[PDB]
Structures are given as C-alpha cells and as structure tokens.
Scaffold this active site. Structure first.
Site, PDB file in Angstrom:
ATOM      1  N   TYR A  96     -18.391 -37.319  36.422  1.00  0.00           N
ATOM      2  CA  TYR A  96     -17.119 -38.005  36.544  1.00  0.00           C
ATOM      3  C   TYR A  96     -16.053 -37.136  37.162  1.00  0.00           C
ATOM      4  O   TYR A  96     -15.046 -37.659  37.634  1.00  0.00           O
ATOM      5  CB  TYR A  96     -16.637 -38.476  35.181  1.00  0.00           C
ATOM      6  CG  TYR A  96     -17.539 -39.492  34.574  1.00  0.00           C
ATOM      7  CD1 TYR A  96     -17.513 -40.797  34.995  1.00  0.00           C
ATOM      8  CD2 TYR A  96     -18.425 -39.147  33.590  1.00  0.00           C
ATOM      9  CE1 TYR A  96     -18.338 -41.725  34.451  1.00  0.00           C
ATOM     10  CE2 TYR A  96     -19.254 -40.068  33.042  1.00  0.00           C
ATOM     11  CZ  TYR A  96     -19.209 -41.355  33.473  1.00  0.00           C
ATOM     12  OH  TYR A  96     -20.047 -42.283  32.919  1.00  0.00           O
ATOM     13  N   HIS A 129     -20.348 -40.293  25.231  1.00  0.00           N
ATOM     14  CA  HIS A 129     -21.244 -39.471  26.029  1.00  0.00           C
ATOM     15  C   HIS A 129     -21.734 -38.257  25.271  1.00  0.00           C
ATOM     16  O   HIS A 129     -22.850 -37.798  25.505  1.00  0.00           O
ATOM     17  CB  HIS A 129     -20.546 -39.041  27.301  1.00  0.00           C
ATOM     18  CG  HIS A 129     -20.083 -40.183  28.133  1.00  0.00           C
ATOM     19  ND1 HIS A 129     -20.715 -40.558  29.295  1.00  0.00           N
ATOM     20  CD2 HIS A 129     -19.065 -41.053  27.959  1.00  0.00           C
ATOM     21  CE1 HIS A 129     -20.096 -41.602  29.809  1.00  0.00           C
ATOM     22  NE2 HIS A 129     -19.093 -41.924  29.016  1.00  0.00           N
ATOM     23  N   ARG A 133      -9.060 -40.316  27.154  1.00  0.00           N
ATOM     24  CA  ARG A 133      -9.806 -40.162  28.389  1.00  0.00           C
ATOM     25  C   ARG A 133      -9.078 -40.808  29.550  1.00  0.00           C
ATOM     26  O   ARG A 133      -9.148 -40.319  30.678  1.00  0.00           O
ATOM     27  CB  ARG A 133     -11.194 -40.756  28.225  1.00  0.00           C
ATOM     28  CG  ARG A 133     -12.124 -40.411  29.329  1.00  0.00           C
ATOM     29  CD  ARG A 133     -13.426 -41.123  29.155  1.00  0.00           C
ATOM     30  NE  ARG A 133     -14.145 -41.210  30.412  1.00  0.00           N
ATOM     31  CZ  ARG A 133     -15.110 -42.082  30.646  1.00  0.00           C
ATOM     32  NH1 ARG A 133     -15.472 -42.933  29.703  1.00  0.00           N
ATOM     33  NH2 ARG A 133     -15.715 -42.103  31.818  1.00  0.00           N
ATOM     34  N   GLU A 143     -21.389 -43.869  42.752  1.00  0.00           N
ATOM     35  CA  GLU A 143     -20.149 -44.515  42.369  1.00  0.00           C
ATOM     36  C   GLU A 143     -19.009 -44.174  43.308  1.00  0.00           C
ATOM     37  O   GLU A 143     -18.087 -44.971  43.439  1.00  0.00           O
ATOM     38  CB  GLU A 143     -19.788 -44.157  40.939  1.00  0.00           C
ATOM     39  CG  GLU A 143     -20.694 -44.810  39.916  1.00  0.00           C
ATOM     40  CD  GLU A 143     -20.544 -46.324  39.854  1.00  0.00           C
ATOM     41  OE1 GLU A 143     -19.532 -46.855  40.343  1.00  0.00           O
ATOM     42  OE2 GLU A 143     -21.442 -46.991  39.309  1.00  0.00           O
ATOM     43  N   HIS A 179     -17.068 -53.626  44.608  1.00  0.00           N
ATOM     44  CA  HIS A 179     -17.780 -52.497  44.020  1.00  0.00           C
ATOM     45  C   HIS A 179     -19.287 -52.743  44.014  1.00  0.00           C
ATOM     46  O   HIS A 179     -20.075 -51.925  44.517  1.00  0.00           O
ATOM     47  CB  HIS A 179     -17.266 -52.264  42.607  1.00  0.00           C
ATOM     48  CG  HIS A 179     -17.741 -50.995  41.988  1.00  0.00           C
ATOM     49  ND1 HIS A 179     -16.924 -49.903  41.820  1.00  0.00           N
ATOM     50  CD2 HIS A 179     -18.946 -50.644  41.485  1.00  0.00           C
ATOM     51  CE1 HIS A 179     -17.605 -48.932  41.242  1.00  0.00           C
ATOM     52  NE2 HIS A 179     -18.835 -49.355  41.029  1.00  0.00           N
ATOM     53  N   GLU A 180     -19.705 -53.876  43.458  1.00  0.00           N
ATOM     54  CA  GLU A 180     -21.128 -54.162  43.345  1.00  0.00           C
ATOM     55  C   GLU A 180     -21.775 -54.271  44.715  1.00  0.00           C
ATOM     56  O   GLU A 180     -22.864 -53.733  44.948  1.00  0.00           O
ATOM     57  CB  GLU A 180     -21.342 -55.442  42.555  1.00  0.00           C
ATOM     58  CG  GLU A 180     -20.760 -55.393  41.181  1.00  0.00           C
ATOM     59  CD  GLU A 180     -20.919 -54.043  40.550  1.00  0.00           C
ATOM     60  OE1 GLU A 180     -19.917 -53.315  40.453  1.00  0.00           O
ATOM     61  OE2 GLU A 180     -22.046 -53.708  40.147  1.00  0.00           O
ATOM     62  N   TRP A 182     -12.137 -25.905  20.326  1.00  0.00           N
ATOM     63  CA  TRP A 182     -11.820 -27.224  20.849  1.00  0.00           C
ATOM     64  C   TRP A 182     -10.323 -27.449  20.881  1.00  0.00           C
ATOM     65  O   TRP A 182      -9.766 -27.827  21.915  1.00  0.00           O
ATOM     66  CB  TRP A 182     -12.509 -28.288  20.010  1.00  0.00           C
ATOM     67  CG  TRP A 182     -12.147 -29.667  20.351  1.00  0.00           C
ATOM     68  CD1 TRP A 182     -11.321 -30.470  19.666  1.00  0.00           C
ATOM     69  CD2 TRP A 182     -12.623 -30.428  21.452  1.00  0.00           C
ATOM     70  NE1 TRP A 182     -11.232 -31.685  20.270  1.00  0.00           N
ATOM     71  CE2 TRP A 182     -12.029 -31.680  21.375  1.00  0.00           C
ATOM     72  CE3 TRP A 182     -13.491 -30.166  22.502  1.00  0.00           C
ATOM     73  CZ2 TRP A 182     -12.265 -32.661  22.302  1.00  0.00           C
ATOM     74  CZ3 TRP A 182     -13.727 -31.144  23.414  1.00  0.00           C
ATOM     75  CH2 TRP A 182     -13.120 -32.373  23.314  1.00  0.00           C
ATOM     76  N   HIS A 198     -22.524 -50.894  46.046  1.00  0.00           N
ATOM     77  CA  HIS A 198     -23.782 -50.371  45.520  1.00  0.00           C
ATOM     78  C   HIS A 198     -24.966 -50.955  46.272  1.00  0.00           C
ATOM     79  O   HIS A 198     -25.876 -50.229  46.687  1.00  0.00           O
ATOM     80  CB  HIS A 198     -23.923 -50.683  44.039  1.00  0.00           C
ATOM     81  CG  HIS A 198     -23.134 -49.783  43.153  1.00  0.00           C
ATOM     82  ND1 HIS A 198     -23.193 -49.864  41.782  1.00  0.00           N
ATOM     83  CD2 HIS A 198     -22.259 -48.796  43.435  1.00  0.00           C
ATOM     84  CE1 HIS A 198     -22.389 -48.962  41.256  1.00  0.00           C
ATOM     85  NE2 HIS A 198     -21.808 -48.302  42.237  1.00  0.00           N
ATOM     86  N   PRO A 222     -21.170 -56.430  34.809  1.00  0.00           N
ATOM     87  CA  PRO A 222     -21.549 -56.544  36.224  1.00  0.00           C
ATOM     88  C   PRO A 222     -22.351 -55.345  36.694  1.00  0.00           C
ATOM     89  O   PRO A 222     -21.891 -54.207  36.625  1.00  0.00           O
ATOM     90  CB  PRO A 222     -20.199 -56.632  36.937  1.00  0.00           C
ATOM     91  CG  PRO A 222     -19.224 -56.060  35.979  1.00  0.00           C
ATOM     92  CD  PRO A 222     -19.714 -56.421  34.627  1.00  0.00           C
TER      93      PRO A 222
HETATM   94 ZN   LIG Z   1     -20.533 -48.582  40.308  1.00  0.00          ZN
END
Ligand SMILES: [Zn+2]
Ligand SMILES: *[C@@H]1O[C@H](CO)[C@@H](O[C@@H]2O[C@H](CO)[C@@H](O)[C@H](O)[C@H]2NC(C)=O)[C@H](O)[C@H]1NC(C)=O
Ligand SMILES: *[C@@H]1O[C@H](CO)[C@@H](O[C@@H]2O[C@H](CO)[C@@H](O)[C@H](O)[C@H]2NC(C)=O)[C@H](O)[C@H]1NC(C)=O
Ligand SMILES: *[C@@H]1O[C@H](CO)[C@@H](O[C@@H]2O[C@H](CO)[C@@H](O)[C@H](O)[C@H]2NC(C)=O)[C@H](O)[C@H]1NC(C)=O
Ligand SMILES: *[C@@H]1O[C@H](CO)[C@@H](O[C@@H]2O[C@H](CO)[C@@H](O)[C@H](O)[C@H]2NC(C)=O)[C@H](O)[C@H]1NC(C)=O
Ligand SMILES: *[C@@H]1O[C@H](CO)[C@@H](O[C@@H]2O[C@H](CO)[C@@H](O)[C@H](O)[C@H]2NC(C)=O)[C@H](O)[C@H]1NC(C)=O
Ligand SMILES: *[C@@H]1O[C@H](CO)[C@@H](O[C@@H]2O[C@H](CO)[C@@H](O)[C@H](O)[C@H]2NC(C)=O)[C@H](O)[C@H]1NC(C)=O
Ligand SMILES: *[C@@H]1O[C@H](CO)[C@@H](O)[C@H](O)[C@H]1NC(C)=O
Lengths: 198, 557
Positions: free
Chosen positions: B497, B487, B255, B384, B356-357, B459, B360, B328
C-alpha cells in the site's frame, strides 16, 4: 451428373482429432465449387496454389479433403512455412501447396459443459513431421537419459493431451473445424473438375 | 538434453495441466460467489483442494532441476516461482500448531464483541456497529469508550497468540535461507542478474526511508491544519502544540483520515462535483455505465471487451433470492474468459468503480499470452496502481462535461479545486505515515530488534514520533494494539500500500506528458490520446517476464 461428396465431408457429425486426421480422396466427377457457400459461417477462405479466379475451369487428377478439429488461434499455423506444435507434431504443409484450407467455428456443437476430452493432440515428439505425414503411436516420450521402460514418471511423459472445450471460452480457445483441399496433377488427361455452362 | 531441455519440457507439461485445473477451480469459486447455496460450497472446496494438491505435488516434483545450470531468464523465473518450499518445511506438529493459531486469530478478530458498561446485554461487533460509532459520532466520551474497549477486550486475546506466531513464522522463514520473516516478505521486490536492473532485498528499506523523508514537509502542514480545525469541534481536549489524540481521527485505527472531511472542509458553501442526479435524470443504467467505461478505454487505443464479457458478467444485483457477495471484483478464470462481479447502482461512486474494475480487466487482457506462471503484475503494487489511474482520470470535470453529465459551460473556480485536493489528501497522504510506520514496526519485530517486553513501548514511541498521534490511555505490555488490525492478525503484507501510492502518480505524470497537458497535474486527462495508450500497453503486455525495474522504466524513464 455425379457430384463430389462435399456435403458428406463438409457436414460429418463427428470430426477427427488433429493428430489422427481424416483424409478422404475424391475421384473423377464434376467439381461444383461455388456451392460450398451454403452455410458459410466460415473463418478463413484463403488459397495458395489456385487463386480465387480459376474456381472451376481448371482440373486436377484427384483431390484430397483433410478434416480435423483444432483450437482457434492455431488456424494461423496451418500454412506452408509455419512453426508451432500443430505445424510440427500434428500436421505439416508443403511449401509447394496447391490446394487450400478452410475453417469455421463450431462452438455450439463440439463444446460441452463439463469438458469434451475426445479431441487430443500431440505436444511431444523426437523430431518434426514430414509434409502429409501421419503418426498415431502412443509410445511414452522419453525426456531424460534414463529409459523408463514404458511407464509415466520422471523425465518421461505420455505424449498426448486434450482440449477441454467448453462454451464459456473466448475465441482462440474454441473448437474450429478445418478442411484442407489439396489438388494433384500428375499425368491424367481427363479427371475431375468443374461443370461447363450449357 | 543436459538440464535445460528437460526443464523446458516439464514446464510445457505444467503449463498445459495447471491451466485447466485452475480454470475449473476458479469457475467453481465464481459460481459459489454469485449464487450462494450449500452444494456450491462443496464443489468449490473439491475444486480447491484438487488444485492445491496438484500444485504441491508439482512443487515436490520440480525440486530436481538445479537453478544454477539454467541460462534462459524466462524458464529460470518460472522454475524459481515453482520451486519455493513455502511452508511445509516445518514439522507436522509445528505446521498444525501454526495453522491453528492462524484460524484462532482470524476468528477472534471476526467475531469479537464489546458491550456497554451499563447495559451489558447490548454487545456490539466491530463491523456493523463499532466502526460506525467511530465514523459518525462526535461525542468525545463515546469515541473514547469504543476505542478503548475494542483494544482492551479483543487486543488482549491476540497477544499470547501473536507472540507464538512470530516464532513459528521466523522458523519457517529461516529454514528457507531468509534470516527472518520480514526478509521473506521483502523478497517480492528482489531482482537478480540482469546487469543494470538489480535490486537487493535490503535496498527496499533504504528506498522507503528516503522517499518518506520528502513527504514530512507536506504531512506536517496537513497535520497542523487538521489540528487547528479540530480545536473547534473538541475544545479543551486538543493542545495547540501537541499531537492528536488517537481516537479522534475518523476510524478505529487512523488508517484513513477521510472522515474528518466534514469537519475540515475549506469552503463549505461550495458543493463539489456530483452527477448522481443527472444520471437518473437522463435514465442511465448499468449497461450505459459500462458502455461508457469501455468507450473511454477504447478511446486511448486499448481493445474492446471480449463480447463474452457482456453475457457472463453479473452487472446488476439478482433480485429475488440469489444471495451473492456484493464486493466489486474482476475475474480472470483464464482461457479467454474475463468477467466482472459487482452490484451496481446508478451513482457517481459506481461510475468510478466501473473504471477501476475495467482497468483491472484491461490489464489482464494484455499479458494473457504469457506462460501461466507469469500472469501477474510486475510486482504486488502494479495492479492496483494501473487500476487507480483510470478512475483518477475519469473523474475530472473536463471528462464529465465531455460525456454529457455536466452543463456544457459549468465554469469552475479555484475554490472547488481546493475542496477537491483536500478531500484527496486526507486519503492519499494521511495514510502514508501510518503505513510506513506499521510496516517498520513489524520488520523490527521479526528481526529481533525489539525484545518482546517492549512491543507496546516501541509502538507508542513510533506513533508519537512518525505519525504524530498520542494515545489517550496508557497501555502496558498486556495489550497488543497492532494485532487489532485486519492485515496484522490475518498475516498480509502491508508495504504494497505504500509503493502503490507512489507508482500511481509516476504513471499519471508520464502519461500526462504524452498527452501534452499544460495546466495543473490534477486536471490531466488521457482520453483521446493514443500515444498514452501505447506507452501504457508496452508495459501492460509484459507480466512478470521482465524485472519490475525494467517495466517501470519502460514508462517513467
Ligand atoms: Zn483494484
Ligand atoms: C448437416 O447434417 C445435419 C444432420 O443431418 C442437418 O440437420 C438437419 O437439418 C434439416 C433441415 O435444417 C432438419 O430437417 C433435420 O432434422 C436435421 N437433422 C437432424 C439430425 O437434426 C443439416 O441440415 C446438414 N447440413 C447441410 C448443409 O445439409
Ligand atoms: C443457484 O444454485 C441453485 C442450487 O445449486 C440452483 O437451483 C437448482 O439448480 C439445479 C441445477 O441443475 C436445477 O436442476 C434446479 O432446478 C434448481 N432449483 C431451483 C429451485 O432453481 C439454481 O438454478 C442456481 N441459479 C441459477 C441461476 O442457475
Ligand atoms: C529462451 O530465451 C530465448 C531468448 O532469450 C527465447 O526465444 C524467444 O522465443 C519466442 C518463441 O518461443 C520468440 O517469439 C522470440 O522472438 C524469441 N526471442 C529471441 C530473442 O529470439 C526462448 O523462448 C526462451 N525459451 C523458452 C522455452 O521460451
Ligand atoms: C525444499 O525442501 C526440501 C526438504 O523438504 C529441501 O531439501 C532437499 O530436498 C530434496 C528433495 O527431497 C533432496 O534431494 C535434497 O537432498 C534436500 N537437501 C538439499 C537440497 O540440501 C530443499 O532444498 C528445499 N528447496 C528449496 C529451494 O528451498
Ligand atoms: C481564487 O482566485 C481569486 C482570483 O484569482 C483570488 O482572489 C484574489 O486573491 C488575491 C490574493 O491575495 C487578492 O490579492 C485579490 O484581491 C483577490 N481578488 C479579488 C477579486 O478579491 C482568490 O484568493 C483565490 N482563492 C483561492 C482559494 O485560490
Ligand atoms: C475525443 O475526440 C472526439 C472527436 O474529436 C470527440 O467527439 C466529438 O467531439 C466534439 C467536440 O466537443 C463534439 O462536438 C462531437 O459531438 C463529438 N462527437 C462524437 C461522435 O463523440 C470526443 O468528444 C472527444 N472526447 C474527449 C474526452 O475529449
Ligand atoms: C469495438 O466495438 C465497436 C462496436 O460498438 C466497433 O464499432 C469497433 O470497431 C470495435 N473496435 C475494436 C478495436 O474491436
């Protein structure tokens, strides 16, 4: 001299909820204005009728002190010509207002960990209140066209709800004690007003 | 009083009830997360089911105002968000059967173990110990053993459960007029009736397939460079014209390629920017970090912190025994109470996670004047993205030397530029073909275009064609390789994403213009620019009130 019972109305341990607000009339005595600055945490000392230049020289037949407790960001609604739940279903102010309003934060007192559901307010009514009107009925508000014969359910709710005041709230969601001093000059020649300097 | 006024009054009652119930639920959950005890779990579950039952009964009660008679867009949006049956449209047998296989799959993934072929008393879990082998090792045989055993011992248990989960989910989605589950998932980008900003649920597929057609020219060059750089760490195993073997990519699935950085750094003798030393040297603490973050945010024109934020927030790790989940996050309990939960350590990484936080939080402080049901990003990808552009801009040397963590001169060179851009591209770009591929498989599986005897065949065809990696060992129809991903097995939408990666740069470009930036884009810095703050705020303060195509236009154009 006999002084206004200011400290007895400005320091009541338990205030009234907004929809059933407290009204105390002050009769003929001496009006010491510049003593209310004792604590002075305050939030808004604005005045509409008398501007802050006639604090004690002017007189009025009688004055009314209205006391209650609201949430923070609703203090703005306490003004002649405002709209909102508090300005329509809990308190109305006439456009010719001659007194003025005073507010201060009281978070440390009227907020309890776990919720303080003793204060309520009306959010449903068939029409807007009138200036200085007071309503206490608890009839089940009907929304739909089907009468509910007095039982909560579809299209008919209990027209009351309560602030869940807590200490961990932001400003605008905290309790605020409010006092409205409305003046009155009908016909009295001699009445209550400020002292003169001797 | 026909239909709309009753709906409005009902929405008022709901807004004033759920606002309190949610506060209680979230407060219990926070207290549990920050101080792990036993009774805390009980209070948390009590508040949780209390809120959930209220939501369900309100749902059943709201299925009487017909959506066709409402005219206001706001109340229509709220009622539509509230009316959806979701699950529970199934039978009770069926619903219990579904809730059982969900937990079974999640547990299999969480507690599956594989162990050595020679000392079978050495069983490893995935989290602490398998994706460490896959992330650190360089032994071809060890990586191959891990990659193969994880799929052969855990993937083989999820297949008969996934085959049964597909059917139930498709039934639950068809009972709500959706034609499949995939359409139910894409139903988050749908916009109806604004006359100029519409968006069908089927248009998303074309948008994704068209935006991916312009990345292949760059992904191909990146893939070729990485393949050429791997033929020196694993000689004789990589063909210079073939794909890449799937077990050499850095983690168990591929990923992120961000672990191939050590092997493929362009100019290894030029250490990239790091200020971990200069922070402990100037004696910095959590409080200094977050004060600097708040300063950067107020610099562009956004408000301060609410000052209750400083008291309730758990910025530093509680020492003795206060077992807490260090991950976090930002909390929006409501009614004016925003908090942060993170176990900071003076580092460079935490200096960016702080931004980042706080991004938000600054998003949440904006739309706090909206109805309770309209407090969220315009769609699932906005939150995000807004959080990410802040850390993107707060890592430039132009900003660090302005803070003081750098030498006042610090002449930069066009070699650290490449060393930085490549480390970025291994995370950003290396993950776009994977995402777009995986979500294309699921969309085709739910739809029915792949009969269940050809899941692995499709696949591993799409892997070779789109992503460009090949498997090292054949896989028949007894395996299930996609189900061995977090996921997939835990039923999370994966397209958020993809789009989030796109928006994150569109914003960064538009704001970059409002700040009147000149040089390359990767040196942009929006600090000290108030017009950028205004352009951003005029989109932040909307919430879900407007269709996301309008909020996106308010910024980009
Ligand atoms: Zn975030
Ligand atoms: C408002 O009333 C309270 C309660 O009577 C007063 O609090 C008292 O304060 C004095 C001195 O600060 C103490 O000695 C008393 O013990 C307090 N009373 C109680 C019940 O604790 C407060 O002072 C009053 N405010 C004003 C401005 O007079
Ligand atoms: C973390 O949770 C534990 C258990 O819920 C708390 O420990 C007890 O909490 C009760 C709650 O009032 C107190 O009466 C006890 O005195 C506490 N016992 C001990 C040994 O602390 C603990 O207080 C919580 N942490 C914090 C910071 O409050
Ligand atoms: C119905 O829609 C109208 C506008 O389409 C909303 O009117 C707004 O009301 C808010 C206060 O509630 C005002 O601040 C706005 O200025 C109004 N907008 C306009 C264009 O006048 C109305 O609020 C909607 N209904 C409900 C219940 O919110
Ligand atoms: C939500 O599910 C219900 C069934 O649980 C659907 O069926 C309607 O339910 C209401 C409430 O009992 C009845 O009054 C209707 O007669 C039912 N049938 C209809 C409307 O055709 C309901 O349609 C579902 N709603 C949505 C939005 O999916
Ligand atoms: C970094 O910049 C330097 C200087 O601009 C580059 O060095 C020049 O590169 C060109 C490209 O062919 C050569 O013709 C010159 O002879 C080089 N200059 C010197 C003094 O040798 C360098 O190539 C750049 N590197 C990167 C990675 O961008
Ligand atoms: C944002 O602008 C302010 C004011 O222009 C900058 O603050 C001053 O910047 C000058 C220029 O380097 C310094 O000499 C002063 O010491 C700074 N004073 C203060 C109080 O900060 C600030 O550095 C600018 N920030 C960015 C990121 O450009
Ligand atoms: C933010 O807080 C600082 C205190 O450090 C104060 O000086 C500043 O005026 C505040 N600004 C706003 C917008 O609240």
């Amino acid at each position: 001299t006999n002084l206004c019972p200011f400290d007895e109305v400005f320091n009541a341990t338990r205030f009234a909820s907004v929809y059933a607000w407290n009204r105390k009339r002050i009769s003929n005595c001496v009006a010491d204005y510049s003593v209310l600055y004792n604590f002075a945490p305050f939030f808004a000392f604005k005045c509409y009728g008398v501007s802050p230049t006639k604090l004690n020289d002017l007189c009025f037949t009688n004055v009314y002190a209205d006391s209650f407790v609201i949430r923070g960001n609703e203090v703005s609604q306490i003004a002649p010509g405002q709209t909102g739940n508090i300005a329509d279903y809990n308190y109305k102010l006439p456009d010719d207002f001659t007194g003025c309003v005073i507010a201060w934060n009281s978070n440390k007192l009227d907020s309890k960990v776990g919720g303080n559901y003793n204060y309520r307010y009306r959010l449903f009514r068939k029409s807007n209140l009138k200036p200085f009107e007071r309503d206490i009925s608890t009839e089940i508000y009907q929304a739909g066209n089907k009468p509910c014969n007095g039982v909560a359910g579809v299209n008919c709710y209990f027209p009351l709800q309560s602030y869940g005041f807590r200490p961990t709230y932001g400003v605008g969601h905290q309790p605020y004690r409010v006092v409205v001093l409305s003046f009155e000059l009908l016909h009295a020649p001699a009445t209550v007003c400020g002292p003169k300097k001797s | 009083s026909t239909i709309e006024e009753q709906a409005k009054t009902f929405l008022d009652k709901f807004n004033h009830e759920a606002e309190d119930l949610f506060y209680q639920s979230s407060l219990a959950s926070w207290n549990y997360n920050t101080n792990i005890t036993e009774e805390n779990v009980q209070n948390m579950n009590n508040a949780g089911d209390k809120w959930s039952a209220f939501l369900k009964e309100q749902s059943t009660l709201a299925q009487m105002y017909p959506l066709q008679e409402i005219q206001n867009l706001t109340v229509k949006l709220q009622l539509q968000a509230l009316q959806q049956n979701g699950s529970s449209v199934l039978s009770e047998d069926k619903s219990k059967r579904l809730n059982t296989i969900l937990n079974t799959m999640s547990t299999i993934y969480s507690t599956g173990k594989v162990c050595n072929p020679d000392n079978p008393q050495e069983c490893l879990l995935l989290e602490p110990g398998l994706n460490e082998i896959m992330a650190n090792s360089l032994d071809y045989n060890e990586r191959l053993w891990a990659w193969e055993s994880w799929r052969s011992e855990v993937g083989k248990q999820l297949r008969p459960l996934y085959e049964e989960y597909v059917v139930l989910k498709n039934e639950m989605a068809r009972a709500n007029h959706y034609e499949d589950y995939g359409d139910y998932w894409r139903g988050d980008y749908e916009v109806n009736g604004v006359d100029g900003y519409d968006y069908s649920r089927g248009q998303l597929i074309e948008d994704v397939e068209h935006t991916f057609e312009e990345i292949k020219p760059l992904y191909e060059h990146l893939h070729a460079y990485v393949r050429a750089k791997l033929m020196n760490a694993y000689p004789s195993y990589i063909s210079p014209i073939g794909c890449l073997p799937a077990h050499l990519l850095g983690d168990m699935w591929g990923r992120f390629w961000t672990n191939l950085y050590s092997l493929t750094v362009p100019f290894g003798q030029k250490p990239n920017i790091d200020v971990t030393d200069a922070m402990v040297d100037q004696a910095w603490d959590a409080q200094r970090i977050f004060k600097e973050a708040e300063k950067f945010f107020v610099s562009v024109g956004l408000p301060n912190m609410t000052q209750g934020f400083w008291e309730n927030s758990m910025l530093t790790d509680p020492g003795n025994v206060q077992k807490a989940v260090c991950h976090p996050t930002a909390w929006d309990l409501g009614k004016g109470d925003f908090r942060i939960l993170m176990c900071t350590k003076v580092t460079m990484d935490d200096f960016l996670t702080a931004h980042h936080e706080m991004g938000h939080i600054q998003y949440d402080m904006a739309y706090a004047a909206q109805p309770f049901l309209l407090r969220n990003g315009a769609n699932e990808g906005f939150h995000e993205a807004v959080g990410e552009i802040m850390s993107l801009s707060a890592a430039t040397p132009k900003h660090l030397k302005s803070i003081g963590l750098l030498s006042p001169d610090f002449q930069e060179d066009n070699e650290t530029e490449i060393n930085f851009l490549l480390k970025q591209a291994l995370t950003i770009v290396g993950t776009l073909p994977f995402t777009y591929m995986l979500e294309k498989w699921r969309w085709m599986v739910f739809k029915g275009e792949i009969p269940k005897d050809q899941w692995m065949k499709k696949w591993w065809e799409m892997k070779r064609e789109i992503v460009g990696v090949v498997e090292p060992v054949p896989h028949d129809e007894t395996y299930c390789d996609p189900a061995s991903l977090f996921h997939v097995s835990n039923d999370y939408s994966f397209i958020r994403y993809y789009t989030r990666t796109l928006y994150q740069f569109q914003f960064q470009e538009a704001l970059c213009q409002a700040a009147k930036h000149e040089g390359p884009l990767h040196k942009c810095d929006i600090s000290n620019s108030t017009e950028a703050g205004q352009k951003l705020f005029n989109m932040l303060r909307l919430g879900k009130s407007e269709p996301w195509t309008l909020a996106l236009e308010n910024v980009v154009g």
